[PDB]
Ligand binder design. Structure first.
Ligand SMILES: [Zn+2]
Length: 544
């Protein structure tokens, strides 16, 4: 009965999707699929973050328009996410007319409400190219150790940090020209005006405890005003009444959440839902799934901007940690910086969705993909616990009983144990305690296989006159599989489709209360095959 709008952060248009992105989009997709299974109205929304100086310059280097480049990367991104079955209701772009008009609207409201301040800044400027230089497009000699060819605000030899204006013999990365200091008027959002409002939200208890603690450090340091403008040349939206000025991506990127939802509503011919979700009086819920590096922005700048432009604020932020591989940050030289597209040449989507889900929780903790453990855990849990309950029992049903399951449960007490667990498992999916849910499901899977072991169908099958016993045992195993695959349906969309085809039934959350009795099932080939370390070695080699 709830109306829920769920987002992931917008992937930057100038890089490929990797396993880091996939942790976030899989976490949200599992939660979204569970919310849909419980009958809520869910809108799962994302977009490509497509503006800015790095994109402008990359397109120039490639000799194509930025529009052509971001269109190609947006197609690549959506192809990867579709390969992982991320079930967005809309995937849009920050470079869109919807985002242009909402960025202009929010800015004009911030301005008339007094939250925009004009300030003159000084910044390095490339007079040959004719553009201001972001720090990482300035290179020079480290002032401390005199190492040449250092970029930006830090030296990769001695580790010093400094303003790029302290570099010796500085050079523009764009043109090679010596940069010079130049003044420019910039427009700043007066975030500090919202400190009392933001402090109340922090102590309200909605946010994760680790997030609220970090916010207290940021209030202690003191909130600053934030630049929301950039000088031409730029790839972005021009600021109205301010020729030669553009909105910086800090302003237009989160508005992409709104523009993507407005686009979805407009395509649907829906003229009411946008205001229903975004007006201050909304009874809809708004959730952002984000990583650690986005917390300051989404917990302070974003709700402040919404407040100052008369829109509702997020209901909650759901923050996850970083991905590591074999215990360490992803490493190109070791082949553990793994792209989403590369992953799918070697493994299916369900394997990674399962592994991540088994590790995730409601806390902010880094999530380690140990590749040896990945092989072991997929084989142990998917092939040998859950899929085993179908594969060990379906052959007898199809071959000796014409595909027909028994007319009554062999062990109704055991079946109730499985259906009784729905409340705790569903609450674990609801609360983002994914690892708790998977632990609960796998303990049930152990119990189901112990039941089959105790009944010993490989013995019953060879014994004269025990046909009814065999059909009863195997039908019981299959009904236990029906329940477990319902609990796993948010996690394993493709295996679930194969399970539904075998069972001749859609799996619904409430449907587990009616076991399949006197019911025809279909033959199947292989629901899920083993993986091995040779495939892990191939993936690592391919990613070097
Ligand atoms: Zn140095």
């Amino acid at each position: 009965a709830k109306k829920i709008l769920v987002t992931c952060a917008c992937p930057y248009a100038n890089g490929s999707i990797h396993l880091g992105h996939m942790l976030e989009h899989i976490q949200a997709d599992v939660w979204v699929r569970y919310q849909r299974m419980r009958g809520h109205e869910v809108n799962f929304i994302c977009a490509d973050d497509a503006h800015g100086t790095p994109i402008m310059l990359k397109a120039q280097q490639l000799g194509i328009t930025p529009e052509q480049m971001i269109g190609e990367m947006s197609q690549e991104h959506q192809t990867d996410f579709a390969g992982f079955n991320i079930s967005y209701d809309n995937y849009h772009s920050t470079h869109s007319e919807e985002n242009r008009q909402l960025s202009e609207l929010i800015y004009s409201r911030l301005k008339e409400n007094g939250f925009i301040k004009n300030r003159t800044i000084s910044q390095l400027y490339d007079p040959e190219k004719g553009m201001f230089l972001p720090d990482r497009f300035v290179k020079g000699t480290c002032p401390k150790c005199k190492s040449p060819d250092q970029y930006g605000d830090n030296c990769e030899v001695c580790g010093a940090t400094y303003s790029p204006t302290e570099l010796i013999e500085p050079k523009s990365v764009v043109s090679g020209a010596t940069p010079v200091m130049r003044d420019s008027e910039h427009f700043f959002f007066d975030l500090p005006s919202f400190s009392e409002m933001l402090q109340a939200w922090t102590r309200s208890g909605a946010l994760q405890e680790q997030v609220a603690n970090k916010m207290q450090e940021w209030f202690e340091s003191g909130l600053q005003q934030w630049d929301i403008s950039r000088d031409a040349p730029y790839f972005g939206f021009e600021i109205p009444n301010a020729p030669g000025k553009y909105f910086y991506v800090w302003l237009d990127a989160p508005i992409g959440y709104m523009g993507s939802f407005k686009n979805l509503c407009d395509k649907r011919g829906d003229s009411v839902s946008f205001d229903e979700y975004w007006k201050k009086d909304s009874t809809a819920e708004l959730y952002h799934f984000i990583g650690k590096d986005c917390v300051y922005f989404h917990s302070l700048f974003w709700p402040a901007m919404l407040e100052g432009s008369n829109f509702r604020k997020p209901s909650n932020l759901f923050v996850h940690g970083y991905v590591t591989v074999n215990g360490a940050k992803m490493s190109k030289s070791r082949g553990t910086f793994i792209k989403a597209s590369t992953w799918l040449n070697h493994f299916d989507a369900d394997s990674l969705r399962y592994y991540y889900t088994a590790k995730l929780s409601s806390r902010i903790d880094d999530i380690d993909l140990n590749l040896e453990d990945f092989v072991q855990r997929v084989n142990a849990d998917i092939v040998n616990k859950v899929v085993n309950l179908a594969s060990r029992n379906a052959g007898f049903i199809n071959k000796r009983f014409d595909g027909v399951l028994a007319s009554e449960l062999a062990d109704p007490q055991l079946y109730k144990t499985f259906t009784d667990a729905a409340e705790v498992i569903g609450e674990a999916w609801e609360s983002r305690e994914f690892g708790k849910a998977v632990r609960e499901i796998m303990a049930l899977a152990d119990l189901a296989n112990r039941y089959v072991d105790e009944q010993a169908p490989w013995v019953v099958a060879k014994q004269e006159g025990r046909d009814a016993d065999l059909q009863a045992i195997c039908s019981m195993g299959i009904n236990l599989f029906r329940v477990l695959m319902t609990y796993l349906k948010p996690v394993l969309p493709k295996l679930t489709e194969r399970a539904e085809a075998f069972l001749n039934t859609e799996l619904t959350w409430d449907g587990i209360q009616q076991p399949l009795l006197g019911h025809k099932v279909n033959p199947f080939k292989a629901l899920y095959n083993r993986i091995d370390m040779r495939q892990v070695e191939a993936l690592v080699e391919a990613s070097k």
